[PDB]
Amino acid sequence: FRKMAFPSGKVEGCMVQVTCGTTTLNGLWLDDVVYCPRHVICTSEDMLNPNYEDLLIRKSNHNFLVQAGNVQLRVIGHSMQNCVLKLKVDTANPKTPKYKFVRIQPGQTFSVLACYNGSPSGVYQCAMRPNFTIKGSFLNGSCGSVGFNIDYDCVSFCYMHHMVLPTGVHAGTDLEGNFYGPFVDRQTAQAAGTDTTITVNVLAWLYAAVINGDRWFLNRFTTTLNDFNLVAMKYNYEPLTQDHVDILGPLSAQTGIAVLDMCASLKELLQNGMNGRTILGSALLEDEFTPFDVVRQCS
Amino acid sequence: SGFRKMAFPSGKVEGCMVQVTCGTTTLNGLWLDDVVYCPRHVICTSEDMLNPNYEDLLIRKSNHNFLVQAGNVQLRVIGHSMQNCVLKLKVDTANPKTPKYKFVRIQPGQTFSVLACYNGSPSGVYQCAMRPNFTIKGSFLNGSCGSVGFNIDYDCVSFCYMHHMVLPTGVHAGTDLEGNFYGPFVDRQTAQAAGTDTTITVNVLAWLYAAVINGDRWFLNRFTTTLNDFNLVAMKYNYEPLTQDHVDILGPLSAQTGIAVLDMCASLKELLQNGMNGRTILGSALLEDEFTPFDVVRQCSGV
Ligand SMILES: *[C@@](O)(CO)[C@H](C[C@@H]1CCNC1=O)NC(=O)[C@H](CC(C)C)NC(=O)c1cc2c(OC)cccc2[nH]1
Ligand SMILES: *[C@@](O)(CO)[C@H](C[C@@H]1CCNC1=O)NC(=O)[C@H](CC(C)C)NC(=O)c1cc2c(OC)cccc2[nH]1
């Protein structure tokens, strides 16, 4: 098993750069709107303690430089929505894919198209942690890079990059500008809460192991969802929700192993350990593959 | 900040993928200018693939025997030749989205991005390394043949891999875009083993430097080693020898971190002899060898 990103071309065709003063970052051009982090309006000193409503009052359309490559797109309107700026431009992007804006849950994965100066640089798969950070790879100039999933022909954008934390993980918003987690867009060191293991994804991984004939860990027991959640929390594992149980449905049907029987197997692995054994060639339980990723790599 | 297995953006390649069908055999092709490149075993029937005389099988085909679909459009084949294990279909239409490109044959230990495709449709993109035994640890399913591997520099796509085969061990084998396999493999329907799969030492060292740049030094030690004494231990553990060129190529990472290359060699020697003792590096419980020094430099320079 490996991390696989979605093909990035539909998103590449939407990346632009946005500059205000000497402050430059990336934006997302869909139809005639460009979406970007609102701190582009800040000088470096402004970002220490910004009052964004007051800073924006001092800006007009003609203070925003939007470029597709080196080609300028004239800005004809602007507004703030939470921590994102929306710049209306006078050109509808001919490369706009079918798209939606979605807000994901911890545990869900997405592809990040890391960009610099409006130019796509690399693509990789990330998982939203329970503490609402991602382990990205981002350098200066990466803000406004986006994360997304592709379903059929539709790009679902879920993430726009804003922040690195002192621990070197990343934080950002959805495309309506609402941060994931307790973070704010300020030039300040902010701590993320203690993280936990993504249980639903570990279960998906165990189903993947079974699909491939690696099933020594299957035990004879079952559990209730409540009892499992209480045990899991003592091992720093997330509780399962009903949605988690439901998204495990297809893998449960494919293998014939009920979700709560697999939970009882995992409980035993937590309580008793691996006994120097491996699962899918690994002593670590992997928690960054969703049930969809498992299906997507097995078929 | 951070270090992740990263692929190049795939859009320039997506615009070149098409579907090639001959008989009941369908796989992917690569459409550049007015030529479509694909694995020649498309011309094969199920019975042919056991021992295909490709020159014999190809001469019996006509241009119209090849159905090339690009999205909803069918491209008319107006010529066809064979270059080793790659078929070259001349089409009457030049692909308008052809990027600047070159064909290159990659060296073992180098990385490239793979755009996995099915029925001419891009499905996923990931980074691989060409292993010392000339296999790649890919993710490919039925119908993935003709998927390509590439690197991008500025605006130029260097195609280096086209996919053909899975081995019994689950690793993968393919050719360059001149149709020559990497490794001792053959495009016939047989179970093939690779040579011994050694570890790309210069890459493990780069990844250790990446781990240091990202704040983890638990594996470092106060010891050093000579290059030869390191290589003696490395070869004992089925690692490739480190050459002076590798040492030099690691210079920028050594400069950035302040850790002499042979001091990092002494760290790796200790990891090989003692193991990792349940600890992890950059989240991995194994020594990773599929990032090149340049992969690390481009993600971690300045951090
Ligand atoms: C965007 O490029 C800014 O436009 C930038 C992305 C980071 C640069 C290096 N890697 C990244 O992911 N974001 C920032 O520089 C933000 C700007 C905010 C939104 C105004 N700043 C931080 O992420 C930042 C500031 C501080 C800090 O201060 C003090 C102390 C510790 C961490 C930290 N992160
Ligand atoms: C191509 O899509 C075929 O067009 C296909 C890709 C593999 C399918 C499963 N995963 C893959 O990477 N390649 C093949 O099916 C090739 C066809 C050759 C080039 C004629 N064959 C193999 O991959 C192959 C055959 C055998 C085998 O036999 C008998 C025994 C064991 C492994 C094996 N692989």
Side-chain angles (χ1 to χ4, degrees), chain A residues 1-2 4-43 45-56 59-73 75-97 99-150 153-185 187-219 221-274 276-291 293-299, chain B residues 1-45 48-49 51-71 73-89 91-99 101 103-152 156-221 224-297 299-300 302-303:
Chain A
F1 254 69
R2 81 153 39 232
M4 307 189 7
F6 287 99
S8 63
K10 286 173 172 61
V11 181
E12 286 166 59
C14 303
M15 305 299 317
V16 296
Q17 41 178 336
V18 182
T19 296
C20 182
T22 60
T23 304
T24 302
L25 42 60
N26 304 282
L28 181 73
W29 181 18
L30 300 168
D31 292 319
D32 62 344
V33 180
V34 170
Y35 306 77
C36 73
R38 65 178 174 172
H39 71 261
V40 69
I41 69 182
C42 296
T43 67
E45 190 65 22
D46 285 337
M47 310 163 182
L48 282 317
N49 183 32
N51 182 326
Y52 284 108
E53 295 77 14
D54 280 14
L55 292 179
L56 193 58
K59 300 293 185 204
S60 314
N61 293 326
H62 64 79
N63 296 131
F64 293 97
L65 178 54
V66 174
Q67 299 166 292
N70 276 337
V71 178
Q72 175 181 11
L73 306 172
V75 174
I76 62 177
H78 61 284
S79 58
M80 208 165 44
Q81 180 177 13
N82 302 309
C83 300
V84 287
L85 191 70
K86 296 190 293 200
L87 304 173
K88 190 174 271 303
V89 290
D90 71 349
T91 306
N93 187 358
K95 291 175 183 309
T96 300
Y99 76 92
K100 41 191 217 153
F101 289 171
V102 309
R103 183 176 182 76
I104 59 172
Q105 286 303 105
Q108 290 195 252
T109 54
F110 53 99
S111 296
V112 169
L113 179 64
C115 295
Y116 297 92
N117 311 293
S119 193
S121 175
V123 62
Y124 55 89
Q125 181 219 254
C126 268
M128 181 62 68
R129 303 307 304 180
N131 71 355
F132 300 109
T133 64
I134 63 172
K135 288 95 154 83
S137 175
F138 285 127
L139 297 170
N140 283 334
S142 60
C143 286
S145 300
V146 297
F148 59 97
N149 283 276
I150 302 180
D153 56 328
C154 185
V155 175
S156 287
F157 297 102
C158 59
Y159 179 86
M160 177 161 284
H161 183 52
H162 295 246
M163 296 292 289
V164 58
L165 305 194
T167 54
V169 298
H170 299 101
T173 66
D174 65 18
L175 268 292
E176 298 179 327
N178 289 126
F179 263 90
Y180 293 97
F183 310 112
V184 295
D185 44 348
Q187 188 74 5
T188 72
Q190 296 168 55
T194 73
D195 205 16
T196 51
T197 300
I198 305 158
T199 307
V200 62
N201 289 359
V202 173
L203 295 169
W205 178 253
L206 297 175
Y207 277 110
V210 169
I211 286 161
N212 289 286
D214 200 357
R215 55 177 185 267
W216 60 264
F217 48 88
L218 294 178
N219 70 21
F221 327 104
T222 196
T223 182
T224 63
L225 193 58
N226 185 239
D227 190 64
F228 174 77
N229 279 358
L230 296 172
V231 178
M233 280 198 324
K234 295 161 168 211
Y235 291 84
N236 213 52
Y237 266 63
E238 275 307 291
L240 295 171
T241 67
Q242 184 59 42
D243 288 350
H244 291 154
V245 172
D246 295 339
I247 61 168
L248 286 164
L251 288 171
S252 179
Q254 182 181 345
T255 58
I257 307 301
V259 173
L260 289 169
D261 292 5
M262 187 67 85
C263 286
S265 289
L266 177 55
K267 176 182 307 183
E268 202 197 311
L269 290 175
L270 298 182
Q271 292 183 318
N272 296 134
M274 305 267 305
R277 282 192 100 161
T278 51
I279 295 172
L280 287 167
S282 173
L284 306 189
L285 290 177
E286 169 65 50
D287 80 339
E288 287 215 344
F289 291 96
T290 68
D293 305 318
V294 163
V295 153
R296 146 174 205 246
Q297 270 181 62
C298 292
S299 43
Chain B
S1 23
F3 190 68
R4 300 295 320 293
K5 204 158 253 183
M6 199 180 296
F8 287 102
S10 61
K12 290 178 165 61
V13 183
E14 290 172 50
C16 303
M17 304 307 305
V18 299
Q19 181 173 194
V20 179
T21 292
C22 196
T24 63
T25 310
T26 285
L27 41 62
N28 307 280
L30 183 71
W31 179 25
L32 301 171
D33 293 318
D34 61 340
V35 179
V36 174
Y37 300 80
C38 71
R40 67 183 173 169
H41 68 262
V42 70
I43 72 184
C44 286
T45 88
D48 293 331
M49 294 179 179
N51 189 32
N53 199 324
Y54 281 111
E55 292 275 7
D56 209 46
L57 299 170
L58 183 56
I59 206 76
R60 315 189 184 240
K61 288 270 145 43
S62 307
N63 281 343
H64 78 266
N65 287 129
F66 295 105
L67 180 58
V68 181
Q69 301 153 224
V73 188
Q74 174 201 306
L75 307 169
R76 172 157 174 257
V77 175
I78 61 150
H80 64 272
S81 55
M82 170 160 74
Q83 180 175 6
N84 303 308
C85 304
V86 160
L87 179 58
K88 283 139 85 172
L89 303 176
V91 287
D92 73 338
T93 312
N95 178 4
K97 308 179 192 150
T98 307
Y101 75 96
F103 292 167
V104 308
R105 189 170 173 93
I106 205 93
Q107 300 297 327
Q110 286 316 288
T111 51
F112 55 101
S113 292
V114 169
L115 180 66
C117 297
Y118 301 89
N119 299 291
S121 291
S123 170
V125 71
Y126 52 89
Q127 218 202 24
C128 286
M130 177 51 71
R131 321 262 332 138
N133 72 355
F134 291 110
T135 66
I136 70 165
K137 307 164 155 192
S139 189
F140 291 118
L141 306 170
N142 283 352
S144 54
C145 288
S147 294
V148 296
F150 60 97
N151 282 285
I152 310 192
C156 186
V157 177
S158 290
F159 293 104
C160 61
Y161 178 86
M162 169 168 284
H163 183 50
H164 291 247
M165 305 260 310
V166 60
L167 308 193
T169 56
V171 301
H172 295 102
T175 66
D176 66 23
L177 268 297
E178 292 179 347
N180 295 301
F181 265 90
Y182 293 97
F185 310 108
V186 181
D187 49 341
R188 60 165 61 181
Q189 188 79 353
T190 63
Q192 296 173 52
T196 297
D197 191 354
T198 47
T199 299
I200 305 157
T201 306
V202 65
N203 285 9
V204 179
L205 293 166
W207 170 82
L208 291 178
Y209 279 110
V212 169
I213 291 168
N214 280 279
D216 206 350
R217 320 168 112 261
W218 72 256
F219 47 88
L220 304 177
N221 60 40
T224 202
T225 182
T226 63
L227 185 55
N228 184 73
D229 288 343
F230 169 76
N231 279 332
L232 280 176
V233 172
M235 297 190 285
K236 179 188 192 200
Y237 285 89
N238 237 15
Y239 274 53
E240 290 287 301
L242 191 74
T243 68
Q244 185 57 48
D245 289 357
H246 297 154
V247 169
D248 296 335
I249 283 153
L250 283 168
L253 296 172
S254 182
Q256 186 176 339
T257 55
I259 299 166
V261 171
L262 294 174
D263 293 348
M264 194 63 93
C265 287
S267 175
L268 178 49
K269 183 183 298 173
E270 182 161 41
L271 288 163
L272 291 178
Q273 287 171 351
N274 304 346
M276 283 162 68
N277 293 317
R279 312 201 47 151
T280 56
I281 300 172
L282 281 174
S284 177
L286 303 178
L287 298 177
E288 298 289 339
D289 78 335
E290 297 209 348
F291 301 83
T292 69
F294 185 52
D295 281 321
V296 176
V297 156
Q299 284 192 56
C300 298
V303 169

